[PDB]
Structure 1
Amino acid sequence: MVKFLGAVPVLTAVDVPANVSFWVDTLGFEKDFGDRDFAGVRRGDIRLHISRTEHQIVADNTSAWIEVTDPDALHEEWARAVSTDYADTSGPAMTPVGESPAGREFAVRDPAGNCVHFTAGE
């Protein structure tokens, strides 16, 4: 019986190195591998790939969900490095933590335009 061990979302970016810097230097992920065309970052038990695209519209419409034990704690860690002005599409921003039927969560929009959601998980 085939077992499904994990899934790796692929974020997209016109400028991969700049986006990798954000995830690593600002959000605290570690660089796994990569170059300007395809890179990978990781933190804890999860990994994320970042692929180069020639179309900004693709990056602005790419998203991913990540399950963490404590969304609030993570939000607090980043509150000092990321703008809380989500409406300000001028750059990366983070939303407030909110309650949903599925638990607390918040989202981060990286410099490339990807929207990544962080939700409470088990």
Structure 2
Amino acid sequence: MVKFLGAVPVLTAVDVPANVSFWVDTLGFEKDFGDRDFAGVRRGDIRLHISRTEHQIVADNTSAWIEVTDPDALHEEWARAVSTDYADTSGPAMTPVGESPAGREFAVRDPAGNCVHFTAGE
């Protein structure tokens, strides 16, 4: 009987080392492995891969959902280091906490253009 244990979303980026540096140095993830074509980061029980793409439009349409125990606490931690004005596409930024079919969540747009949602989970 095959058990499905975990899922690893794949974010995409034109510049993998630069996007890895944001997840690690700014959001606090840890680097698992990686080079210029493909890297792995992790935090807690989850992992994210970052794969190189030659087309920017692929990354501006890439997204993922991450479940966390407390989106509001995580939002305030990251609010001191990430712009809270999401409409400014001059750089990475974060939305305010809001509500969705799954409950409280917020999103982060990384420098590569990926949109990752941080949603309440149990």
TM-score (norm 1): 0.98
**CA deviation map 1:73-112 (0-9, x unaligned):** 1001100000011000111000000122421000000000
C-alpha displacement of 1:41: 0.2
Deviations 1:57-88 (CA, angstroms, capped at 9, x unpaired): 00000000000000001001100000011000
**How many matched pairs?**
122
In structure 2, list runs of 5 or more residues that go unmatched: none
The 3-state SS of whatever aligns with 2:36 is coil
TM normalised by structure 2 equals 0.98
Worse-superposed segment, 94-103 or 13-22: 94-103
Give the secondary structure class of the aligned counterpart of 1:89.
coil
- Match of 2:61, SS? coil
Partner Cα separation in structure 1 for residue 69 and residue 93 of structure 2: 22
User: Hey, what's the Cα distance between the residues in 2 that align with 1:58 and 1:111?
Assistant: 14
1:93 maps to: 93
- How far, CA to CA, are the matches of 1:101 and 1:58 in structure 2? 26
The Cα RMSD (Å) is 0.6
d(CA) in 1 for partners of 2:55 and 2:45?
Answer: 30
The runs of at least 4 consecutive aligned structure 1 residues that moved more than 4 Å come to: none
Counterpart position of 2:121: 121
Structure 1, gaps ≥5 residues long: none
